[PDB]
Amino acid sequence: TKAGSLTIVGTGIESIGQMTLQALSYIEAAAKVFYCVIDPATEAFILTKNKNCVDLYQYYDNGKSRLNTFTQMSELMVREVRKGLDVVGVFYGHPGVFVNPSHRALAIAKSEGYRARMLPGVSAEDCLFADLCIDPSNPGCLTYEASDFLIRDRPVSIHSHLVLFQVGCVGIADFNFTGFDNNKFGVLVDRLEQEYGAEHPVVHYIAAMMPHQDPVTDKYTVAQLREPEIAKRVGGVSTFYIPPKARKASNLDIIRRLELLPAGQVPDKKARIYPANQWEPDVPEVEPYRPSDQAAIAQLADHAPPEQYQPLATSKAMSDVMTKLALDPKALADYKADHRAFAQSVPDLTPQERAALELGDSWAIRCAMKNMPSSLLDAGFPWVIVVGVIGVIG
Amino acid sequence: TKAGSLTIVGTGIESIGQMTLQALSYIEAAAKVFYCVIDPATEAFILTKNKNCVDLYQYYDNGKSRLNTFTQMSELMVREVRKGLDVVGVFYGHPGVFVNPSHRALAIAKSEGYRARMLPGVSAEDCLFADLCIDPSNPGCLTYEASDFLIRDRPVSIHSHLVLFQVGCVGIADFNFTGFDNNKFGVLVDRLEQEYGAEHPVVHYIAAMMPHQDPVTDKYTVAQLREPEIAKRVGGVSTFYIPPKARKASNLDIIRRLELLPAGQVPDKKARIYPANQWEPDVPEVEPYRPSDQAAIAQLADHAPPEQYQPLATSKAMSDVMTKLALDPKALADYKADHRAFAQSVPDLTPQERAALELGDSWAIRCAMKNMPSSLDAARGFPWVIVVGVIGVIG
Ligand SMILES: C[S@@+](CC[C@H](N)C(=O)[O-])C[C@H]1O[C@@H](n2cnc3c(N)ncnc32)[C@H](O)[C@@H]1O
Ligand SMILES: C[S@@+](CC[C@H](N)C(=O)[O-])C[C@H]1O[C@@H](n2cnc3c(N)ncnc32)[C@H](O)[C@@H]1O
């Protein structure tokens, strides 16, 4: 294996606090850091954690093609990889979600035979779900770039969530330091009118970028987006959320094949699990405390853990080593090079803890860290799921 | 305002490392922590950070309805909020992505007048994009729960990415500790055959849950999913990625209205920005170093920052306060209660720094931490970074 590595990481959206613990650890360990971030508090923070940082934003310029900038950013990173160094690239949000140069740099590095990896981060869509109080699972989610959405005539589903990025620069790919003049916005509004109608809601969303700010969560009708003083509020960090227009019915063949009925139970398509989506037009009130909810809450007084439940039963030495593997990239690289040698040098481990670390298998680690009861084995991964349509049928 | 708050946070997918700095700080600051996580190293880590934690997973049981469990989890959290405490709920991944009880608890607390907020985290879909080397923007992304996909007959787009969660428990909502018997998996395989054809690829994806493990990124044809040896590999943490079957063409009217028009250039739908999606069937090789790429690289030697570029120009004292507001929830609460009193007790700030913090305005803070040059008063101002696809392969 060749000297040199490229790891691309994210900052998240909200300054400093939305960075992951592993993103931070890689930035600290790197020989060289290259970054493109949105706010100066995040920039200042990065520079305190590594002595050899370069700002990629300086490679944009007025009238200079963005694709030429991306080629330059990628080549700067890959040049240091070719010299045998551990390089880290840092981008705003999740570094592979609506970003060009990260994918280019990683693919070049990988094809020339160097180690290459992207670490995930928190994206603007992750913030959207949290701030607007929606779940992509209910009733499904479509995500597009706004100019692509129009140019390639991408389909909408009126029964699912729709999220549109880059609504502030329709049809514009030029760079200018004073930013976008969005004079083809009306082409997007026309499309939304044809798909949803003039009175359907559109939510203007801007996630807070500093820890003290509130998010923008402003509902307008499609028609109001034609008003000049509303249209001008949409800029370079604006995203649209468009809620469903209707509820989709269930397919009788699938109901049969999945054996979800004894008779026609009357699970109406409009019947919902609390809470309902508050942006959806003409959505009725859902009762949070039904008779079945009240009865479930009554059982809490008598509750004990079930006999099959596995309590945590670990040690300081074992918790410390699992933490070190997640937060120290050098410790992890040593462990992966030689499981046994590494396991032997960790002090205070019991024989089981040492044996599980030597093997590295998930089940071995679970047994060393959790007490497994007789009743469970006689018949042990969690099995947590989201419930929607099935829980409201039978 | 009523005493008490609820903050729901995530742990991410890979044990410990994928937790956010703010998730950790809220767990440390809470009066009571309630958690549901699926690996013991993450559980042990949480327990080292707060002395009053309760595992919510103990409220599942064999034959007991998952909805009744959800009602119970929600009520344990909100009972403590109603006592005036700062409560933190912790869920695997992103706490609002394919999760029931988080939304219920937050909605109840909000309607009754308490402070309520969800902090985003890293989901399994975030992991998927990073490990499979795809971008949702190119060529768009549809995400569904697998049983909902079948029952409500949700539409596919053959020209965009498709992501399906919960493919290991098609049609089944019961709880059992010994787990899912995935007997209706064939119903999903039939639908994928109808929509994509028997020889189209499906990627079986499992993100690494421990730091030393590799992800599962195994490509199969739809037809191969009918083989029992392959179907048995699909479990409770399995997600499917199905890549596009074809490239979608551009609309002439939109090209004309957006003025990307001059002469009719012949930018083909199959032509792509490097790199191409490696999972897509019959994807052509794309050249990383075209003549224009080489010309751009040659300009690197003569490069200087543009006149309008804004270098960072801040202080240790200002950087420390902005870091503290992000990592210390009590300091943030104090700052929000009264900007001016907080700003006046921070030592070593310059007059401009102190004034910007008194205002709280993002432009004022930016101007205090960056050298904004005279070539740049257009405001009466973020980076202006975008993704480029179709437009960059036209004009
Ligand atoms: C080039 S993309 C960068 C996306 C980033 N990598 C991420 O993880 O979200 C630019 C677009 O992201 C979205 N975006 C960026 N910041 C945002 C914010 N604070 N709130 C809402 N959307 C935002 C907007 O649609 C913007 O046009
Ligand atoms: C109830 S959901 C929870 C999702 C979680 N909140 C998140 O942010 O991704 C369970 C489903 O998430 C997906 N999932 C969970 N862990 C995963 C992993 N390690 N790799 C791939 N998919 C996973 C699977 O589709 C699984 O059936």
PDB file of N, CA and C and ligand atoms in Angstrom, chain A residues 13 92-94 97-99 123-124 165-166 205-207 209 236-239, chain B residues 385-387, ligand 1:
ATOM      1  N   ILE A  13     -23.994  22.380   9.039  1.00  0.00           N
ATOM      2  CA  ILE A  13     -24.561  23.657   8.557  1.00  0.00           C
ATOM      3  C   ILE A  13     -24.367  24.748   9.613  1.00  0.00           C
ATOM      4  N   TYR A  92     -18.483  22.549   3.656  1.00  0.00           N
ATOM      5  CA  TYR A  92     -19.726  22.894   4.339  1.00  0.00           C
ATOM      6  C   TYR A  92     -20.778  21.783   4.246  1.00  0.00           C
ATOM      7  N   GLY A  93     -21.472  21.527   5.345  1.00  0.00           N
ATOM      8  CA  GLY A  93     -22.534  20.530   5.377  1.00  0.00           C
ATOM      9  C   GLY A  93     -22.025  19.092   5.287  1.00  0.00           C
ATOM     10  N   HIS A  94     -22.641  18.300   4.404  1.00  0.00           N
ATOM     11  CA  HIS A  94     -22.148  16.957   4.034  1.00  0.00           C
ATOM     12  C   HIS A  94     -21.338  17.167   2.728  1.00  0.00           C
ATOM     13  N   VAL A  97     -22.947  16.093  -0.805  1.00  0.00           N
ATOM     14  CA  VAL A  97     -24.350  16.448  -1.070  1.00  0.00           C
ATOM     15  C   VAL A  97     -24.344  17.826  -1.744  1.00  0.00           C
ATOM     16  N   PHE A  98     -24.728  17.869  -3.036  1.00  0.00           N
ATOM     17  CA  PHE A  98     -24.631  19.079  -3.856  1.00  0.00           C
ATOM     18  C   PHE A  98     -23.220  19.746  -3.802  1.00  0.00           C
ATOM     19  N   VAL A  99     -22.163  18.970  -4.044  1.00  0.00           N
ATOM     20  CA  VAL A  99     -20.767  19.478  -4.095  1.00  0.00           C
ATOM     21  C   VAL A  99     -20.068  18.851  -5.314  1.00  0.00           C
ATOM     22  N   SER A 123     -26.284  17.525   6.400  1.00  0.00           N
ATOM     23  CA  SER A 123     -26.628  18.396   5.262  1.00  0.00           C
ATOM     24  C   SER A 123     -27.763  19.387   5.524  1.00  0.00           C
ATOM     25  N   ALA A 124     -27.976  20.306   4.574  1.00  0.00           N
ATOM     26  CA  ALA A 124     -29.116  21.229   4.672  1.00  0.00           C
ATOM     27  C   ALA A 124     -30.471  20.500   4.683  1.00  0.00           C
ATOM     28  N   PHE A 165     -33.290  22.355  -3.909  1.00  0.00           N
ATOM     29  CA  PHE A 165     -32.074  23.145  -3.573  1.00  0.00           C
ATOM     30  C   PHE A 165     -31.779  24.170  -4.684  1.00  0.00           C
ATOM     31  N   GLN A 166     -31.085  25.263  -4.346  1.00  0.00           N
ATOM     32  CA  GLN A 166     -30.592  26.251  -5.340  1.00  0.00           C
ATOM     33  C   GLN A 166     -31.703  26.970  -6.113  1.00  0.00           C
ATOM     34  N   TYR A 205     -37.266  27.938   3.274  1.00  0.00           N
ATOM     35  CA  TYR A 205     -36.458  27.448   4.375  1.00  0.00           C
ATOM     36  C   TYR A 205     -34.994  27.912   4.292  1.00  0.00           C
ATOM     37  N   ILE A 206     -34.516  28.528   5.382  1.00  0.00           N
ATOM     38  CA  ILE A 206     -33.086  28.803   5.593  1.00  0.00           C
ATOM     39  C   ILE A 206     -32.731  28.329   7.013  1.00  0.00           C
ATOM     40  N   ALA A 207     -31.876  27.317   7.089  1.00  0.00           N
ATOM     41  CA  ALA A 207     -31.344  26.835   8.375  1.00  0.00           C
ATOM     42  C   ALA A 207     -30.462  27.912   9.024  1.00  0.00           C
ATOM     43  N   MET A 209     -27.332  29.470  10.552  1.00  0.00           N
ATOM     44  CA  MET A 209     -25.885  29.201  10.390  1.00  0.00           C
ATOM     45  C   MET A 209     -25.040  29.579  11.634  1.00  0.00           C
ATOM     46  N   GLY A 236     -29.002  32.782  -2.146  1.00  0.00           N
ATOM     47  CA  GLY A 236     -28.069  31.686  -2.376  1.00  0.00           C
ATOM     48  C   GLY A 236     -28.085  30.551  -1.363  1.00  0.00           C
ATOM     49  N   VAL A 237     -28.568  30.792  -0.136  1.00  0.00           N
ATOM     50  CA  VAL A 237     -28.743  29.705   0.850  1.00  0.00           C
ATOM     51  C   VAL A 237     -30.223  29.299   1.077  1.00  0.00           C
ATOM     52  N   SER A 238     -31.120  29.618   0.130  1.00  0.00           N
ATOM     53  CA  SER A 238     -32.550  29.281   0.248  1.00  0.00           C
ATOM     54  C   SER A 238     -32.849  27.895  -0.348  1.00  0.00           C
ATOM     55  N   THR A 239     -33.697  27.132   0.349  1.00  0.00           N
ATOM     56  CA  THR A 239     -34.211  25.830  -0.118  1.00  0.00           C
ATOM     57  C   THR A 239     -35.756  25.887  -0.038  1.00  0.00           C
TER      58      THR A 239
ATOM     59  N   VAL B 385     -21.683  29.536  -3.281  1.00  0.00           N
ATOM     60  CA  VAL B 385     -21.203  28.253  -3.764  1.00  0.00           C
ATOM     61  C   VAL B 385     -22.417  27.435  -4.259  1.00  0.00           C
ATOM     62  N   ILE B 386     -22.290  26.840  -5.449  1.00  0.00           N
ATOM     63  CA  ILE B 386     -23.326  25.979  -6.037  1.00  0.00           C
ATOM     64  C   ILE B 386     -22.753  24.697  -6.638  1.00  0.00           C
ATOM     65  N   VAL B 387     -23.618  23.693  -6.766  1.00  0.00           N
ATOM     66  CA  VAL B 387     -23.310  22.512  -7.550  1.00  0.00           C
ATOM     67  C   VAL B 387     -23.656  22.824  -9.015  1.00  0.00           C
TER      68      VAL B 387
HETATM   69  C1  LIG C   1     -23.712  23.872  -3.147  1.00  0.00           C
HETATM   70  S1  LIG C   1     -25.007  23.521  -2.183  1.00  0.00           S
HETATM   71  C2  LIG C   1     -24.226  22.999  -0.747  1.00  0.00           C
HETATM   72  C3  LIG C   1     -24.943  21.903   0.063  1.00  0.00           C
HETATM   73  C4  LIG C   1     -24.176  21.325   1.289  1.00  0.00           C
HETATM   74  N1  LIG C   1     -23.045  20.469   0.913  1.00  0.00           N
HETATM   75  C5  LIG C   1     -25.128  20.521   2.165  1.00  0.00           C
HETATM   76  O1  LIG C   1     -24.739  19.495   2.784  1.00  0.00           O
HETATM   77  O2  LIG C   1     -26.312  20.907   2.283  1.00  0.00           O
HETATM   78  C6  LIG C   1     -25.805  25.008  -2.022  1.00  0.00           C
HETATM   79  C7  LIG C   1     -27.309  24.883  -1.690  1.00  0.00           C
HETATM   80  O3  LIG C   1     -27.540  24.203  -0.446  1.00  0.00           O
HETATM   81  C8  LIG C   1     -28.700  24.691   0.225  1.00  0.00           C
HETATM   82  N2  LIG C   1     -28.346  25.370   1.500  1.00  0.00           N
HETATM   83  C9  LIG C   1     -27.118  25.806   1.853  1.00  0.00           C
HETATM   84  N3  LIG C   1     -27.154  26.408   3.070  1.00  0.00           N
HETATM   85  C10 LIG C   1     -28.442  26.365   3.487  1.00  0.00           C
HETATM   86  C11 LIG C   1     -29.166  26.835   4.675  1.00  0.00           C
HETATM   87  N4  LIG C   1     -28.494  27.457   5.684  1.00  0.00           N
HETATM   88  N5  LIG C   1     -30.491  26.602   4.744  1.00  0.00           N
HETATM   89  C12 LIG C   1     -31.151  25.972   3.736  1.00  0.00           C
HETATM   90  N6  LIG C   1     -30.538  25.519   2.623  1.00  0.00           N
HETATM   91  C13 LIG C   1     -29.212  25.692   2.450  1.00  0.00           C
HETATM   92  C14 LIG C   1     -29.297  25.713  -0.728  1.00  0.00           C
HETATM   93  O4  LIG C   1     -30.290  25.063  -1.563  1.00  0.00           O
HETATM   94  C15 LIG C   1     -28.088  26.179  -1.530  1.00  0.00           C
HETATM   95  O5  LIG C   1     -28.521  26.740  -2.765  1.00  0.00           O
END
